[PDB]
Structure formats: C-alpha cells, structure tokens
C-alpha cells in the first residue's frame, strides 16, 4: 500500500 510504500509514504506520510 501507498502508506507502507516508501515513495508513496513519503508523499503520503499523512495516512501512514
């Protein structure tokens, strides 16, 4: 998932 992703977590460090 985007949240457990690196880049997608970077971008979405909100959710995660």
Swiss-Prot record:
Q: What is its main location?
A: secreted
Keywords, sorted A to Z: Acetylcholine receptor inhibiting toxin, Amidation, Disulfide bond, Ion channel impairing toxin, Neurotoxin, Postsynaptic neurotoxin, Secreted, Signal, Toxin
Q: What happens on changing residue 12 to A?
A: About 2700-fold decrease in ability to inhibit alpha-3-beta-2 nAChR
Reported impact of residue 9 to A: 2-fold and ~20-fold decrease in ability to inhibit alpha-6/alpha-3-beta-2-beta-3 and alpha-3-beta-2, respectively
Give tissue specificity per the record. Answer: Expressed by the venom duct.
**Where found?**
Secreted
- What result follows from mutating residue 4 to A? 4.9-fold decrease in ability to inhibit alpha-3-beta-2 nAChR
Altering residue 5 to A: what's the impact? Answer: >2700-fold decrease in ability to inhibit alpha-3-beta-2 nAChR
Changing residue 10 to A: reported impact?
Answer: 1.5-fold decrease in ability to inhibit alpha-3-beta-2 nAChR
Which region ranges are annotated with the description Ser-Xaa-Pro motif, crucial for potent interaction with nAChR? 4-6
- Cysteine amide PTM positions read 16
Which pairs are disulfide-linked?
2-8, 3-16
This protein's record includes keyword Disulfide bond: yes
Alphabetical GO CC annotations of the entry are: extracellular region; host cell postsynaptic membrane
Q: Name one GO molecular function term.
A: toxin activity
What this protein is reported to do is described as: Alpha-conotoxins bind to the nicotinic acetylcholine receptors (nAChR) and inhibit them. This toxin blocks neuronal mammalian nAChRs (alpha-6/alpha-3-beta-2-beta-3 (0.39 nM) > alpha-3-beta-2/CHRNA3-CHRNB2 > alpha-3-beta-4/CHRNA3-CHRNB4 = alpha-4-beta-2/CHRNA4-CHRNB2). Also exhibits inhibition of D.melanogaster alpha-7/CHRNA7 nAChRs. In addition, inhibits alpha-6/alpha-3-beta-4 (CHRNA6/CHRNA3-CHRNB4) nAChR with a higher potency on human (IC(50)=1.49 nM) than on rat receptors (IC(50)=31.5 nM).
How are the domains described in the entry? The cysteine framework is I (CC-C-C). Alpha4/7 pattern.
* Similarity comment text for this entry: Belongs to the conotoxin A superfamily.
Name the record gives this protein: Alpha-conotoxin MII
Q: Which organism is it from?
A: Conus magus
